[model samples]
Target: GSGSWQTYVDEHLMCDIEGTGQHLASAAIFGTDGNVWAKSSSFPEFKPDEINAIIKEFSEPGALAPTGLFLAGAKYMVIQGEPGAVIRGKKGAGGICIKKTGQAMVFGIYEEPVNPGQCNMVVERLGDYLVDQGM
Candidate 1:
């Protein structure tokens, strides 16, 4: 199972983020120029009122809707050399996926919502790779 899970990243290579507070975010590090760029959207910023509303909406059914609340700071990788490097997280059980698009590599789903520690790990890994690559 562990081996399979490790290999999982090599297979799909795409991640999608969906649902209430979920949004797609991306950061780019150019190999040639050694530049880092990033962007995220689709999900709204963390707002107390909005969160309260969401909680209220889901409070009744007691059913887990696709809230798209991934653990903050979860990390993912989108290798440029790999194909289908797009990453995604769905609203519910979809979790995170990584996909490669054209020459661009997209990474992340962030662990079924998002986690700060997880995200930090991802960033750290990427940063390490960038440093090693002299980017």
Candidate 2:
């Protein structure tokens, strides 16, 4: 699906990375402006408070603009909006996530541990493709 990392997204260009999966839980998106979406999902949607928690702790007025995805366990990370910031996860589950410039993050969760690299590939696919899409 979506190539090794799942290529089909919202419409055009699309983020492009490569990787694997788990039973696990979910693969979802959280837009900076608050838009949300999902893929290979099973984990529950977050509460309002949970969403705020990530913004307060991870967003950094455009610091993480290094370009590419950031990892925040099951929660997620950034790129142009908050560089290198970790957005944290929920349910004590293991996860993998990513983002680009602006409000938008993609992540996945699992019951057990997973290789960070493999997870990275998945997000990379999305993030890179996202960049290709337009920013």
Candidate 3:
């Protein structure tokens, strides 16, 4: 038998992905109907070396010790260090697109001389909020 579902609007959460790696930044929220909605942002000028560095930092043992150290921040089902987690980005449509695997979200940020650090900071702040929410 099919069951009807009730619907409701909940507060939204944000996450940011930053750094030279493909894991830009993103934000998301879970709906009453058990759906997760998210938005992501990314910086477009990372080279292979930079991406490797970022990945290494996040994967380092005790890396989470840097509380609130996310280049991009948001409420999430999982933080950056969970096994089987993946975050990535790529150049597309003349810009950069960021994606978080296992999290169902993708976003892009254009390359127009914007400060990469600042853009990353924005993502970090939003991501921090989401992380705090225990999502």
Candidate 4:
């Protein structure tokens, strides 16, 4: 099952999420319980607690707005966006988009020269696809 999951990531999730590794700087798929599924080559490493914190923030509103998002050992301010479906955070020239799926979360990170809306489109689209597939 684990190998199949990895193959699914390598052949499906990673490419679809990143548009073949070009649309976003990095992308990753993680289980709801913080288990890793698939990730792009440049996807940042996340600690277990960090992953749990992110899940908690998504489940509870107001939690992340004030504290911002902590990732890659940096802080990104939370910005206004599609509340539940998508959570966006930004710092300087780069940002990240987190999209909720049926059993997982899709992460899309982008930097300067990439539009936030574009990243949202890419991430959310895959999220929708996953949900549709009953993931």
TM-score of each candidate structure, all chains considered together: 0.25, 0.53, 0.30, 0.84
Number of residue pairs clashing in candidate 1, backbone atoms closer than 3 angstroms, sequence gap of 3 or more or interchain: 38
Candidates sorted by lDDT, best first = 4, 2, 1, 3
Candidate 4: tens digits of C-alpha lDDT, residues 1-135: 334445544554345333444557778888999988888888887788778878887788667766778887778898866656788888899898888888888888888777677778877877887788888
Tens digit of per-residue lDDT, candidate 3, span 1-135: 112111101111222223333332333322222243433232322344433333443345343344422323321121233322223222222222223223222233433343344334443344444345432
Worst 10 residues of 3 by lDDT: 1-10
Q: What is the lDDT of candidate 1?
A: 0.32
Lowest-lDDT window of 10 residues in candidate 4? 12-21
TM-score of 2: 0.53
Backbone clash count for every predicted candidate, in the order shown:
38, 19, 26, 0
Once superposed on the true structure, which residue ranges of model 1 sit more than 4 Å away at CA?
A: 1-112
Candidate with the larger lDDT of 1 and 2: 2
In model 3, which regions exceed 4 Å deviation?
1-36, 39-108
What is the C-alpha lDDT profile of model 2 across 12-73, one tens digit per residue? 12222222224324566666654564445344645655554455445454433333222332
Residue 59 in candidate 2, Cα distance off native in Å: 2.3
Worst 10 residues of 1 by lDDT: 28-37
lDDT per residue as tens, model 1, 71-96: 23332222211122222334333243
